[PDB]
Amino acid sequence: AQNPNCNIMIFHPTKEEFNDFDKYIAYMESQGAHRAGLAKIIPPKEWKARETYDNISEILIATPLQQVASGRAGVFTQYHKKKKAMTVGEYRHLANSKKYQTPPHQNFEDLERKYWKNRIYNSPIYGADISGSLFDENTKQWNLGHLGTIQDLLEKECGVVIEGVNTPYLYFGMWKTTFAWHTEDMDLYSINYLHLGEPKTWYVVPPEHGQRLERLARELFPGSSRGCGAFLRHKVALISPTVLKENGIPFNRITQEAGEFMVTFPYGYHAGFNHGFNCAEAINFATPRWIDYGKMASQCSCGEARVTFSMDAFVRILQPERYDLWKRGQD
Numbered sequence: 001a002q003n004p005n006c007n008i009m010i011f012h013p014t015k016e017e018f019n020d021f022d023k024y025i026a027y028m029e030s031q032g033a034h035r036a037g038l039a040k041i042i043p044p045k046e047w048k049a050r051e052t053y054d055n056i057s058e059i060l061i062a063t064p065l066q067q068v069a070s071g072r073a074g075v076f077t078q079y080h081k082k083k084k085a086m087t088v089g090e091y092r093h094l095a096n097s098k099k100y101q102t103p104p105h106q107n108f109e110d111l112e113r114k115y116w117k118n119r120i121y122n123s124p125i126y127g128a129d130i131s132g133s134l135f136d137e138n139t140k141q142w143n144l145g146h147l148g149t150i151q152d153l154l155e156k157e158c159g160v161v162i163e164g165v166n167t168p169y170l171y172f173g174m175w176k177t178t179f180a181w182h183t184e185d186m187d188l189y190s191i192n193y194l195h196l197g198e199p200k201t202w203y204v205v206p207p208e209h210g211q212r213l214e215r216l217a218r219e220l221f222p223g224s225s226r227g228c229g230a231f232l233r234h235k236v237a238l239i240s241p242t243v244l245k246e247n248g249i250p251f252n253r254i255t256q257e258a259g260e261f262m263v264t265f266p267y268g269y270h271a272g273f274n275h276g277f278n279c280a281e282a283i284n285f286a287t288p289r290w291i292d293y294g295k296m297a298s299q300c301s302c303g304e305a306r307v308t309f310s311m312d313a314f315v316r317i318l319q320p321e322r323y324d325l326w327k328r329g330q331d
């Protein structure tokens, strides 16, 4: 069995290997990469996403989210308070202000310590989930706006044509902006490219151990767990590495830098934080190996998780017994 300890693997494809996305995902899996839940892909030196980032300041963040925490430093939830719209140039200035800027630090480990110690005492503002793309249309390799769609994959695998579309999202971050513990909608893959700026630290639980994380989460968030049998779908709970180690939960960590891709694999729980002003682009995707995960994915039906148009068909076709209850949650 490849990668039996479920370590995060890092890949350095050549320019020839970077041509065929599906084939390279399948290669990574042949080497055991999925067992970690997360892999890093460093593009060949010949490649670029676009020519420059000098002209992005006028992109609008229509609904910046202030991430307010509740709890204790290692075990907290966050809620998202909506703020007034601002441009990416306005948000960059905000991120660099004395109130929000990254503190002085020695290295990524010192910054990680500072994050876990102090996150809860601040409310950073995240420009998340903005439909759009920063890939040049002429970038032919690993262009996250030109991937095969999940609807087309389901059709290729299962023969059923469905409605829906699949487009990427931009994330503009600052110090301490946080992504809560989650798997993707319908336990899909995700791919995330860090276009510019400061790093993003990730934590991940191997898919084979995801239920251990869920059982901890039910213990640590007992009211939330009573409210919803899949409350990590709400994407609000944080648990620190120290707490995970104290409870024996298997996980790994890695820091993504600008110019690097990360891939999350079906049912790989992940969480993390941004080091400073940055911009990432991410999208979900599927492969043949996903289908069995999609059929078994948990679902939130309490009404909180509220998701995209295109999840309807995935539930309807892969999970027809759950469909009626899930759809009640959506309405």
Ligand SMILES: O=C(O)CNC(=O)C(=O)O
Residues within 6 Å of the ligand: 171, 178, 179, 190, 191, 192, 264, 270, 280, 282, 283
């Ligand atoms: O970058 C972020 O805030 C969150 N991204 C992801 O969870 C992802 O790419 O799957």
Ligand SMILES: [Mg+2]
Residues within 6 Å of the ligand: 055, 056, 057, 058, 059
């Ligand atoms: Mg612009």
Ligand code: NI
Residues within 6 Å of the ligand: 182, 183, 184, 190, 264, 270
């Ligand atoms: Ni994710």
Ligand SMILES: [Zn+2]
Residues within 6 Å of the ligand: 227, 228, 229, 230, 231, 233, 234, 300, 301, 302, 303, 304, 305
């Ligand atoms: Zn719920």
